[PDB]
Design a protein around this nucleic acid. Structure first.
Lengths: 192, 187
DNA sequence: GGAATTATAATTCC
DNA sequence: GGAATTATAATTCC
């Protein structure tokens, strides 16, 4: 149980780090038979992070503008994964800082699709996008999301419930032989 | 106006022929705007015929077990097509012959899928089948019909009142039964 | 999980 | 209306 529910190959960070919680999502079930998870966005003086939390006992600590310290958390390609191995404490005023405004704006900022298509395959994509279609198949749901200059197709095979201006969390970029698409993954989540 | 609504290349038979109505279908809409049609099965002593009727005035004459005489009807590849040009009269008792048991048996008989697949492409298929698969798509609906023991896939790209087959078209890489102009489905 | 394979639906040309 | 083309979904293999 040390690296349980953590994406494989993730690095372990023993050293404590103090962050400010920007956003958090409601817990949801990402797979049959396993505990729920939620997505979060946090920030330090130097950068903003995207976070997956698998210990539901930590949900209360993840509230807007709350300062917390995390130890023994995991890092999977610039993304922080937290399970029961991690220690999370409400921060003391001594390590409390001010988060630069530009970082927060950036955290709210959504990447553009044109640049998205240029990323390495398997990169995790987060953002708010505009929707042009909803196509329903037995085993998948397909969206087309747009910006001012481009569009990409989104595939969701996970469940058809709760699917009906769209915020996406942890979708997988695929530059196939074909054109690029965004595909659902282990931790893929959709908000309105 | 003659040969109206008739499948093209159909031969014309001016000579009157007297037949017995075995089965008739309820009139239905096979094409947008066009008048309704119904399917029928009739028989003479030598063979059974499948009939497509495009004149709705003729619906009563096509009642079960009724003897009627038809002249100037059309024959499109072994299929009888009737429009308003054709003359249909109630038959007189002297031609009201008896249809042999074997012919009616053939008329009721549904061909088996294994031999169906061997028929020429474009052949029209009629029969009663059992379904074990039903798939709904935006632009079509697909089911599977089977016998003991063989199977074929049926494609329907028309209006989707769907929950016995008439005039389906047999089709390349793998055989299918496809909907056409006069395709009708009964329960 | 992603790409490549196969299955399948819809479009198009004759 | 049928077959071949292309588009699309699902399956499979690494």
């Amino acid at each position: 149980t040390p690296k349980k529910n953590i994406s494989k190959g993730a690095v372990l960070h023993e050293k404590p780090m103090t962050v400010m919680v920007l956003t958090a999502t409601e817990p949801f079930n990402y797979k049959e038979g396993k505990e729920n998870m939620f997505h979060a966005t946090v920030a330090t003086e130097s950068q903003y992070y995207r976070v997956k939390v698998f210990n539901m006992d930590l949900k209360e600590k993840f509230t807007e503008n709350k300062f917390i310290t995390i130890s023994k958390y995991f890092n999977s390609s610039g993304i922080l994964e937290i399970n029961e191995t991690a220690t999370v404490s409400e921060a003391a005023p001594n390590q409390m800082f001010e988060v630069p405004k530009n970082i927060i704006r950036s955290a709210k900022e959504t990447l553009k699709i044109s640049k998205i298509k240029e990323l390495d395959s398997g990169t995790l994509i987060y953002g708010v996008f505009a929707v042009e279609k909803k196509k329903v198949n037995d085993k998948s749901i397909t969206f087309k999301i747009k910006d001012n200059e481009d569009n990409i197709k989104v595939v969701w095979d996970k469940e058809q419930h709760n699917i009906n201006k769209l915020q996406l969390f942890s979708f997988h970029l695929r530059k196939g032989n074909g054109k690029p698409i965004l595909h659902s993954g282990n931790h893929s989540f959709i908000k309105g």
